């Protein structure tokens, strides 16, 4: 669930996805079309086309089991649909966590999602 990808944010990267990725680029938070406009952008195209394959779950709001190894993220339980869940959340936060060194606030928060009106990629 989202307090959970929050966790995981936090973990991976040091900040809250609240705070730094709730708003940017064309598809970091509510909403998303057009194209990423950069890596960080990416990551959160790619974890909303991990939500889309999610089937018999729902991968807003259900509960999957982790637990933290020696600073790695390992995603348990035995439901194969919560497991996913884990899977498109921990991949988001480790894409984040590559990609912290091109992170650009100024161009990219808040961007205006009106911005991504050209054809969109498919995942």
């Not at 991976?12 to 194209?35: D, E, F, I, N, P």
């Not at 394959?53 to 807003?60: A, E, I, L, R, Y």
């Amino acid at each position: 669930n989202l307090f959970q990808f929050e966790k995981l944010i936090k973990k991976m990267t040091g900040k809250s996805g609240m705070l730094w990725y709730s708003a940017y680029g064309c598809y970091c938070g509510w909403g998303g079309q057009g194209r990423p406009k950069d890596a960080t952008d990416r990551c959160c195209f790619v974890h909303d086309c991990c939500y889309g394959k999610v089937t018999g779950c729902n991968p807003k709001m259900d509960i999957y089991t982790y637990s933290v190894d020696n600073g790695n993220i390992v995603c348990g339980g035995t439901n194969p649909c919560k497991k996913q869940i884990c899977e498109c959340d921990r991949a988001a936060a480790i894409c984040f966590r590559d990609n912290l060194k091109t992170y650009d606030s100024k161009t990219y928060w808040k961007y205006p999602k009106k911005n991504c009106k050209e054809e969109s990629e498919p995942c």
